[PDB]
Amino acid sequence: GRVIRNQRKGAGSIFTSHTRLRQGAAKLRTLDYAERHGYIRGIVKQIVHDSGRGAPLAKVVFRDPYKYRLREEIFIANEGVHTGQFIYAGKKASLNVGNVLPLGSVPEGTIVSNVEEKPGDRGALARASGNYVIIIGHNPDENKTRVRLPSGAKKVISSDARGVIGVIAGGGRVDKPLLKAGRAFHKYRLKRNSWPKTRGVAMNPVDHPHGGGNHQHIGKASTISRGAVSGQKAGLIAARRTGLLRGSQKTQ
RNA sequence: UGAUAUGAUGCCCUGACGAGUAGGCAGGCGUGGAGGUCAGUGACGAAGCCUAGACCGUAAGGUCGGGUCGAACGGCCUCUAGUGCAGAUCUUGGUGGUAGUAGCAAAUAUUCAAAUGAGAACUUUGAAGACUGAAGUGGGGAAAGGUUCCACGUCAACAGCAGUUGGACGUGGGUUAGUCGAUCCUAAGAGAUGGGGAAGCUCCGUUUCAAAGGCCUGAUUUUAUGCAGGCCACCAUCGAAAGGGAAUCCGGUUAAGAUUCCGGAACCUGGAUAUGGAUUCUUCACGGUAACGUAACUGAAUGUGGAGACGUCGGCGCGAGCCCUGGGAGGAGUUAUCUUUUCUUCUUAACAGCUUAUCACCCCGGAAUUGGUUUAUCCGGAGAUGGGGUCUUAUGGCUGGAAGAGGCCAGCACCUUUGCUGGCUCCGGUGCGCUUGUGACGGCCCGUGAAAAUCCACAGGAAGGAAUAGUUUUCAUGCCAGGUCGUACUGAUAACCGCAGCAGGUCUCCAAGGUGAACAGCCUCUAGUUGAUAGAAUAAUGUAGAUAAGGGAAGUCGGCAAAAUAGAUCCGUAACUUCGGGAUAAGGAUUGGCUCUAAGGGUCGGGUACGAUCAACUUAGAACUGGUACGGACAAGGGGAAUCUGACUGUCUAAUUAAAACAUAGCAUUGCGAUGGUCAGAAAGUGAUGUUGACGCAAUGUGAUUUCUGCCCAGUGCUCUGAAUGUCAAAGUGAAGAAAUUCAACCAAGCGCGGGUAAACGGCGGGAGUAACUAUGACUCUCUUAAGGUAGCCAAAUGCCUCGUCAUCUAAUUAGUGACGCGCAUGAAUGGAUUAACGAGAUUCCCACUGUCCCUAUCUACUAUCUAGCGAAACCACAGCCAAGGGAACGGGCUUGGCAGAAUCAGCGGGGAAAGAAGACCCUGUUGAGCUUGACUCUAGUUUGACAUUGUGAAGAGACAUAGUUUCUUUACUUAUUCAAUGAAGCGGAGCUGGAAUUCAUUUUCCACGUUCUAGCAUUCAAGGUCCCAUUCGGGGCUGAUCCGGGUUGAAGACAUUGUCAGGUGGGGAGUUUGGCUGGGGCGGCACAUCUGUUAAACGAUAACGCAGAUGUCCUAAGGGGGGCUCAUGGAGAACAGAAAUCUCCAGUAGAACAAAAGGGUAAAAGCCCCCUUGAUUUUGAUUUUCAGUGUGAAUACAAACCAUGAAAGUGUGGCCUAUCGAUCCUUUAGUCCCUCGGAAUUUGAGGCUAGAGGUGCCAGAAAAGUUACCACAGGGAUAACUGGCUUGUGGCAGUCAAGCGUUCAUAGCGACAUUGCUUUUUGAUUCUUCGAUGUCGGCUCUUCCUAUCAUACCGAAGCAGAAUUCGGUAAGCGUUGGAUUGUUCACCCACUAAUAGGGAACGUGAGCUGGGUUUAGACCGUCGUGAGACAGGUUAGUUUUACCCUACUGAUGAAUGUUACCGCAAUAGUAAUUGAACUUAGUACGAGAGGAACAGUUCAUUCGGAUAAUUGGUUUUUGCGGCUGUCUGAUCAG
Ligand SMILES: C=C1[C@@H](O)C[C@H]2C(C)(C)C[C@H](Cl)C[C@]2(C)[C@H]1C[C@H](O)[C@H]1CC(=O)NC1=O
Ligand SMILES: [Mg+2]
Ligand SMILES: [Mg+2]
Ligand SMILES: [Mg+2]
Ligand SMILES: [Mg+2]
Ligand SMILES: [Mg+2]
Ligand SMILES: [Mg+2]
Ligand SMILES: [Mg+2]
Ligand SMILES: [Mg+2]
Ligand SMILES: [Mg+2]
Ligand SMILES: [Mg+2]
Ligand SMILES: [Mg+2]
Ligand SMILES: [Mg+2]
Ligand SMILES: [Mg+2]
Ligand SMILES: [Mg+2]
Ligand SMILES: [Mg+2]
Ligand SMILES: [Mg+2]
Ligand SMILES: [Mg+2]
Ligand SMILES: [Mg+2]
Ligand SMILES: [Mg+2]
Ligand SMILES: [Mg+2]
Ligand SMILES: [Mg+2]
Ligand SMILES: [Mg+2]
Ligand SMILES: [Mg+2]
Ligand SMILES: [Mg+2]
Ligand SMILES: [Mg+2]
Ligand SMILES: [Mg+2]
Ligand SMILES: [Mg+2]
Ligand SMILES: [Mg+2]
Ligand SMILES: [Mg+2]
Ligand SMILES: [Mg+2]
Ligand SMILES: [Mg+2]
Ligand SMILES: [Mg+2]
Ligand SMILES: [Mg+2]
Ligand SMILES: [Mg+2]
Ligand SMILES: [Mg+2]
Ligand SMILES: [Mg+2]
Ligand SMILES: [Mg+2]
Ligand SMILES: [Mg+2]
Ligand SMILES: [Mg+2]
Ligand SMILES: [Mg+2]
Ligand SMILES: [Mg+2]
Ligand SMILES: [Mg+2]
Ligand SMILES: [Mg+2]
Ligand SMILES: [Mg+2]
Ligand SMILES: [Mg+2]
Ligand SMILES: [Mg+2]
Ligand SMILES: [Mg+2]
Ligand SMILES: [Mg+2]
Ligand SMILES: [Mg+2]
Ligand SMILES: [Mg+2]
Ligand SMILES: [Mg+2]
Ligand SMILES: [Mg+2]
Ligand SMILES: [Mg+2]
Ligand SMILES: [Mg+2]
Ligand SMILES: [Mg+2]
Ligand SMILES: [Mg+2]
Ligand SMILES: [Mg+2]
Ligand SMILES: [Mg+2]
Ligand SMILES: [Mg+2]
Ligand SMILES: [Mg+2]
Ligand SMILES: [Mg+2]
Ligand SMILES: [Mg+2]
Ligand SMILES: [Mg+2]
Ligand SMILES: [Mg+2]
Ligand SMILES: [Mg+2]
Ligand SMILES: [Mg+2]
Ligand SMILES: [Mg+2]
Ligand SMILES: [Mg+2]
Ligand SMILES: [Mg+2]
Ligand SMILES: [Mg+2]
Ligand SMILES: [Mg+2]
Ligand SMILES: [Mg+2]
Ligand SMILES: [Mg+2]
Ligand SMILES: [Mg+2]
Ligand SMILES: [Mg+2]
Ligand SMILES: [Mg+2]
Ligand SMILES: [Mg+2]
Ligand SMILES: [Mg+2]
Ligand SMILES: [Mg+2]
Ligand SMILES: [Mg+2]
Ligand SMILES: [Mg+2]
Ligand SMILES: [Mg+2]
Ligand SMILES: [Mg+2]
Ligand SMILES: [Mg+2]
Ligand SMILES: [Mg+2]
Ligand SMILES: [Mg+2]
Ligand SMILES: [Mg+2]
Ligand SMILES: [Mg+2]
Ligand SMILES: [Mg+2]
Ligand SMILES: [Mg+2]
Ligand SMILES: [Mg+2]
Ligand SMILES: [Mg+2]
Ligand SMILES: [Mg+2]
Ligand SMILES: [Mg+2]
Ligand SMILES: [Mg+2]
Ligand SMILES: [Mg+2]
Ligand SMILES: [Mg+2]
Ligand SMILES: [Mg+2]
Ligand SMILES: [Mg+2]
Ligand SMILES: [Mg+2]
Ligand SMILES: [Mg+2]
Ligand SMILES: [Mg+2]
Ligand SMILES: [Mg+2]
Ligand SMILES: [Mg+2]
Ligand SMILES: [Mg+2]
Ligand SMILES: [Mg+2]
Ligand SMILES: [Mg+2]
Ligand SMILES: [Mg+2]
Ligand SMILES: [Mg+2]
Ligand SMILES: [Mg+2]
Ligand SMILES: [Mg+2]
Ligand SMILES: [Mg+2]
Ligand SMILES: [Mg+2]
Ligand SMILES: [Mg+2]
Ligand SMILES: [Mg+2]
Ligand SMILES: [Mg+2]
Ligand SMILES: [Mg+2]
Ligand SMILES: [Mg+2]
Ligand SMILES: [Mg+2]
Ligand SMILES: [Mg+2]
Ligand SMILES: [Mg+2]
Ligand SMILES: [Mg+2]
Ligand SMILES: [Mg+2]
Ligand SMILES: [Mg+2]
Ligand SMILES: [Mg+2]
Ligand SMILES: [Mg+2]
Ligand SMILES: [Mg+2]
Ligand SMILES: [Mg+2]
Ligand SMILES: [Mg+2]
Ligand SMILES: [Mg+2]
Ligand SMILES: [Mg+2]
Ligand SMILES: [Mg+2]
Ligand SMILES: [Mg+2]
Ligand SMILES: [Mg+2]
Ligand SMILES: [Mg+2]
Ligand SMILES: [Mg+2]
Ligand SMILES: [Mg+2]
Ligand SMILES: [Mg+2]
Ligand SMILES: [Mg+2]
Ligand SMILES: [Mg+2]
Ligand SMILES: [Mg+2]
Ligand SMILES: [Mg+2]
Ligand SMILES: [Mg+2]
Ligand SMILES: [Mg+2]
Ligand SMILES: [Mg+2]
Ligand SMILES: [Mg+2]
Ligand SMILES: [Mg+2]
Ligand SMILES: [Mg+2]
Ligand SMILES: [Mg+2]
Ligand SMILES: [Mg+2]
Ligand SMILES: [Mg+2]
């Protein structure tokens, strides 16, 4: 039979990201002298819409400490930051929405976005519109910090790892119904070519494990093992449970 | 054999015999080349070819003559082979019949004359009639073509008639650029390089782990370019003739080029530069409060800003061109009449000067009584309204360019080149106009709508600069230069692609007048066409366009097709609904022309109420008027009530399916925190998601809203912080051994155990009883499950029965709808129920409408048809008249008959089982392929373990058995390895100063140790300070800025990773397989290896899915020997004792027993009881059955042993006889201690030899699952489905006997028990014909035939009074209908009728139709299946080809029987009429009555037929008369 749809995506032909209009990668400043000893000041020169993104970017310019020139950065904008505002980044820096501080330097309950996984990676976690992470504790010996990510997971990372105070802007985007095919259409038009989706059960056997039969139906359990091999994994992969989730979610 | 004559395989005598497919052999014929020979033939004619001329041979063949021909060739003995054609849907080439045939019919359309020419329907010119109608048949380009462009010459081929013409042929000519494109830049993307993979062709990477490069000027005055600074670390390149982008215009000009040439007038870029002006003694300009002004007005490094540079729609404002229009100055048209009229010319480029703007901004001022203000509600104390100013120059105005150009006229000149002279080219108006441009605003987004080259600016101030004369080329003027390639033309019903001059396809710009909402249709101007074979007629049948009286879907599967409707204004508008809709719902009125009335606007002066003038179709109202017409052509929705179904818009099977299928929003579930999830790759320092981060990416399901989503985790999956002594690999460990090796324990993941999980796959019971008639069963019991279908919903697209029952709609309904529900087999995101709105979706009814029909008729155009020119194809064994017969069971040919007369034209669809393809169906084949799965066999990947990469400490266990070599567990180290970051920038350690801190002698320490009201500024090794050079202008050192170690900063760490084996997992993928016989195949059975009896026809042998049965075992005795005894059964007898217990006698041929099927066999046995036993053993041959006289099984008689038993003779080599079973390779055991391990030995081990065991039951013996309707190939009429043939059980029809029925009475009418038949529209049985194809059911149409007669004519019977009916005869002459439901045949109802008989003709009839059903490919549901898929279940959508031949049939001509004409005969063939009612007979005959006829007479009618057109009706190109819309001819007339 045929190579199924989820196998063809990895070869990246018509499936690569539609990148032309994007403002450029959002990152924190490089972690340098200023940021790990002192603080350094910047101005948000603009806050701007990035294509295929939920949340606005903020263009933030700084002075180059080692050379006379301006150096401009692209930040994900936290809700409430504004044009003309001064941004402070460094180990010793006041605790205010929009500033970037090492996770060690903020008290528990602090709310931060675009937080680094390792120190220096210029931010990894909690970048999507509406999201943040909460600092749930410190271990000053071995200087770690325990945080809770948007997924509900709780991870422990270096207290040197930087984050930015506040939550990411443009929240509530997903509360509004798309209402029609076209709105979805233009949505994925600026992301990648994932839409619309043919059901495997509407296909012929060559095309898909679910394909075929004189009635539409899966024909065997749609829960597939991790051990499964490419061309086998479609449906519910490695599911530990299945069915309507009753009762409260929200991990203890 | 006898020479001296010619064949010894010869010659001579004699007898018998002669069929032949497949096949064997023999003797001969013929061909290309080879050795030999005849000193062969031949230019005085070789070879070849032609020849109803000759001769030899049974024949293959040979020889000659004659004709034609021109260079070579043959006989004989031998050699040799690419050696002999009728076939192969054979190969290549050539040629016929078809046939002068099909045809050359789309795109409105042509005509008169002249010229030219051999020749003119077709060329050229003039005229006329039309067309395209600015959404072009106009004017240009992009792709593509490549000379097609232009001129001259010219018609052999080509342009499906023609040709003097051409995109043809021949010969030439033609494409001019600083400014138009390319060129330059960057887009998706492509791709070198240091590198890393790969055996390698090469793959990866593109700034990526790399010592990656070049500018500005200074230093030179050996001199040419070394070094002195300071930068810049930007790191290839290719990629747009529609993106970005330096700069040109107008007039003229060619056969053909032009933003390219000529003329004039500009502009850009680069290089040079000098004069003028500006600037400076206050050096680097002034002015303005400000916005900002300008002719100028130095400015390096570095930095920063801007331009390039950006969506879409909406109304509003403005510009340009076009459109409309007044006056005048010209030219043209019309003028019987009318029109101060109709048409036309009246123009102004780039570039330059001055000037011109919405927005924005500045100054004055200080606002509620809030004001300003847009079509659109936005603005103001963060300063409105007001007054005054500043800016952009889109754009317009005036002038320069520039009237000298161009346009339009008049007046002269003349073979020419061709002039010459004049005049005029002027001033206005209007706008919801049209196209296009642009501005200020507004709407929209989970969409917010490129990049780079390049240009300018500002911040900075390095530096360079004047008074006796410096600075300036962003001000003016001046000089030089601007290369390479493309440039023609077409751009399409003839220049491109479709084999072509093909009705197809193929990107785009410009766009006039009327009607009108309009870029619609229809008519016109400019421009362009007038191309498409032609002539004559107007039969049938057609294609395309129209109309029909009365009826109105009765037609049909179905209203298919057609008709009806329609614009606009006004009135009026239901259920239901998500409140948005439904809605143009539905239903109505009105509409011309002409003549009036009213309302709706602009602009200017008013001291600090109005007047005057000019320019626009809209809306309403009112009269008049007409053959009551008026959206007058054109243009333009049918509507309503329901069911099924998908929410909607959207999507697909190019070329049979547009749908209910796919998608969608919404709903739900799953995986993943980057050392990751999913996915790519041979590999990798590789890749997609990713410019990403859970409001995310990836993976499934369901399918908008509302409502609701029950129970089941036993199974299959998936999953788990679970269990643990069950299973379990390689390495490692232990034991035994001389080792090879053998055995053991330990043991990873996995398995097994346990838990979770259904919006995972999926599932969601059976049986009894029970309430005061019957019924029903709330209730009970009972089996059983993982749970036993909940809410809902239904004969539903899901119900077999089924055309379910009830109701409703109809005259009548297998239809529809509403109900009912023990529902074969409804049911919950396998989603259930509901649902407004929407649908080229399936279905039902209603209104309107109608030629769908009753039932047909008529008209137009183009065909067909006849002519000239032009001219194919399919197909073809030979051919073409029938009836019967037989025959491969449906003949054109054969047999017997009927018959039979040249040559032919138009038609036609009976036949040619016509043509189109080696049957798609069905079976066979040791033939495939797509697909699926716990089929067989593997595999990429993945997981798990071991070893290697692999090093350093310390603590803890483990051994020589409580010194430290070593091995593990734990946790530390960092240099291997791994990850991240950065133009490797501030790391680690110490020291300064502070200070929290309390001092238990002094610091024991720990934090620090230049930046946080503000949308400024931060750069020249840094100013400062200090020391130098020998004071120059410049320049250096140190400090400012603390020391020290050169580890770029982190993460990770001997773990990951990688490499080699090992176990798990692995339809993701690979490969393969998935019995036979068979009254087709399949299910079944076993007739597949066998045994008994019979079939079997008295030796033997013998078939069928023949008949009645049996076999894969059973037995230490049920085997062997010996002795004794006699059985089955019956009678008569004996306490309890009975039909049956145990005892006795008599009779007893086997009537019993001998494992088993049956049949043989047996009585001092072969049966039953007892005694002793292992011969059921050892060796190797022969034989019988089956047979090939192979094997296997089974058996027989001996030989050579050792034994058993009996007194003994004997008997015993398994079971009394006839069935009870198994090759080769391999493993295993027994045997002798025998052979071999090949350099020699010993010992293990291995290998041989003989005999057994492990098994093939498809039994002479492969290792093997499905599906295909997506399907394929080789074949089969050895083989099914359809016609036809034989049969006639079954079906149907008819008899004989006569017991009964019929009040009585067998036979009026019937008729049992029996029995004899016929028929071939029943259904079976068969398998003969067709599988290189004989098109399926039904209906429509139409003809003919049969009779077993429904009606109609004439009769005979009756349980015949009349009337009605029944039975029978001669009878097929004549008729046998209209509808509702169903695809139906059939069935069933309504209704009419004289009657509504049954049948055949390839189950008549598809080149006759139709295509509803069946039966390909799409799709929904039910049932089944794990699945692919299946269903003889339900449902929807699904390309119907060719006639010109022969014959038949219908009509139509016609040679020749001397010529020609007229009038006639009649052989043969055809033939036609049919049924009813009324009046009267007659209220009669007959009858108790009720009732109740007929003949003759008369008048009408039905069905059919042949004519005819006085009448009535239909038809209209009589385009005959009239009327009407729109436009065109100036008006009128007339068109
Ligand atoms: C398939 C087989 C094995 O799988 C099992 C085997 C036993 C049953 C163990 C013994 C018999 Cl006796 C033979 C056979 C059935 C064997 C037969 C196989 O065709 C042999 C026979 C031969 O010669 N070459 C083979 O290849
Ligand atoms: Mg990309
Ligand atoms: Mg897509
Ligand atoms: Mg989906
Ligand atoms: Mg989908
Ligand atoms: Mg499908
Ligand atoms: Mg599959
Ligand atoms: Mg599967
Ligand atoms: Mg399936
Ligand atoms: Mg399904
Ligand atoms: Mg002979
Ligand atoms: Mg002769
Ligand atoms: Mg000759
Ligand atoms: Mg010659
Ligand atoms: Mg020879
Ligand atoms: Mg040859
Ligand atoms: Mg040959
Ligand atoms: Mg032959
Ligand atoms: Mg031949
Ligand atoms: Mg032949
Ligand atoms: Mg032959
Ligand atoms: Mg001809
Ligand atoms: Mg013809
Ligand atoms: Mg034709
Ligand atoms: Mg013509
Ligand atoms: Mg016209
Ligand atoms: Mg038009
Ligand atoms: Mg052109
Ligand atoms: Mg010619
Ligand atoms: Mg030609
Ligand atoms: Mg021609
Ligand atoms: Mg160039
Ligand atoms: Mg490359
Ligand atoms: Mg380029
Ligand atoms: Mg370009
Ligand atoms: Mg361009
Ligand atoms: Mg020229
Ligand atoms: Mg000045
Ligand atoms: Mg652009
Ligand atoms: Mg210009
Ligand atoms: Mg002023
Ligand atoms: Mg207006
Ligand atoms: Mg915008
Ligand atoms: Mg500028
Ligand atoms: Mg200049
Ligand atoms: Mg042309
Ligand atoms: Mg064409
Ligand atoms: Mg005009
Ligand atoms: Mg033609
Ligand atoms: Mg009429
Ligand atoms: Mg009519
Ligand atoms: Mg009517
Ligand atoms: Mg129908
Ligand atoms: Mg209808
Ligand atoms: Mg229709
Ligand atoms: Mg309606
Ligand atoms: Mg009127
Ligand atoms: Mg229905
Ligand atoms: Mg739909
Ligand atoms: Mg199709
Ligand atoms: Mg459709
Ligand atoms: Mg279609
Ligand atoms: Mg590598
Ligand atoms: Mg769907
Ligand atoms: Mg419930
Ligand atoms: Mg329960
Ligand atoms: Mg379960
Ligand atoms: Mg082991
Ligand atoms: Mg189950
Ligand atoms: Mg229920
Ligand atoms: Mg019904
Ligand atoms: Mg009906
Ligand atoms: Mg039901
Ligand atoms: Mg039943
Ligand atoms: Mg459920
Ligand atoms: Mg279901
Ligand atoms: Mg609803
Ligand atoms: Mg519809
Ligand atoms: Mg014809
Ligand atoms: Mg004629
Ligand atoms: Mg032709
Ligand atoms: Mg015949
Ligand atoms: Mg005969
Ligand atoms: Mg024949
Ligand atoms: Mg006859
Ligand atoms: Mg025929
Ligand atoms: Mg034919
Ligand atoms: Mg065949
Ligand atoms: Mg076979
Ligand atoms: Mg296939
Ligand atoms: Mg299986
Ligand atoms: Mg499996
Ligand atoms: Mg660094
Ligand atoms: Mg390791
Ligand atoms: Mg697999
Ligand atoms: Mg397979
Ligand atoms: Mg087999
Ligand atoms: Mg078979
Ligand atoms: Mg046989
Ligand atoms: Mg069978
Ligand atoms: Mg057999
Ligand atoms: Mg046997
Ligand atoms: Mg016999
Ligand atoms: Mg025999
Ligand atoms: Mg049988
Ligand atoms: Mg005896
Ligand atoms: Mg034995
Ligand atoms: Mg035999
Ligand atoms: Mg033999
Ligand atoms: Mg036997
Ligand atoms: Mg023996
Ligand atoms: Mg023996
Ligand atoms: Mg015995
Ligand atoms: Mg064995
Ligand atoms: Mg032995
Ligand atoms: Mg040895
Ligand atoms: Mg030897
Ligand atoms: Mg040796
Ligand atoms: Mg066999
Ligand atoms: Mg054998
Ligand atoms: Mg056999
Ligand atoms: Mg074999
Ligand atoms: Mg099928
Ligand atoms: Mg019969
Ligand atoms: Mg019969
Ligand atoms: Mg019968
Ligand atoms: Mg009798
Ligand atoms: Mg009687
Ligand atoms: Mg019958
Ligand atoms: Mg046959
Ligand atoms: Mg047959
Ligand atoms: Mg056939
Ligand atoms: Mg045939
Ligand atoms: Mg045929
Ligand atoms: Mg036929
Ligand atoms: Mg009587
Ligand atoms: Mg009679
Ligand atoms: Mg007759
Ligand atoms: Mg019907
Ligand atoms: Mg009925
Ligand atoms: Mg028949
Ligand atoms: Mg038939
Ligand atoms: Mg047909
Ligand atoms: Mg059909
Ligand atoms: Mg159908
Ligand atoms: Mg259709
Ligand atoms: Mg034909
Ligand atoms: Mg025809
Ligand atoms: Mg009377
Ligand atoms: Mg009487
Ligand atoms: Mg008649
Ligand atoms: Mg008059």
XYZ file of C-alpha atoms (C1' of nucleotides) and ligand atoms in Angstrom, chain A residues 196-200 202, chain B residues 662-666 701-703, ligand 5:
15
model
C -8.489 20.485 5.825
C -8.273 16.912 7.114
C -9.527 13.859 5.303
C -10.623 11.110 7.702
C -8.673 7.888 7.175
C -13.115 7.813 4.237
C -15.531 14.377 0.722
C -14.772 18.929 3.350
C -16.438 22.464 6.937
C -17.482 25.120 11.623
C -18.883 22.834 16.302
C -13.125 10.071 15.555
C -18.037 12.520 15.108
C -20.063 16.224 12.011
Mg -12.637 15.558 8.054
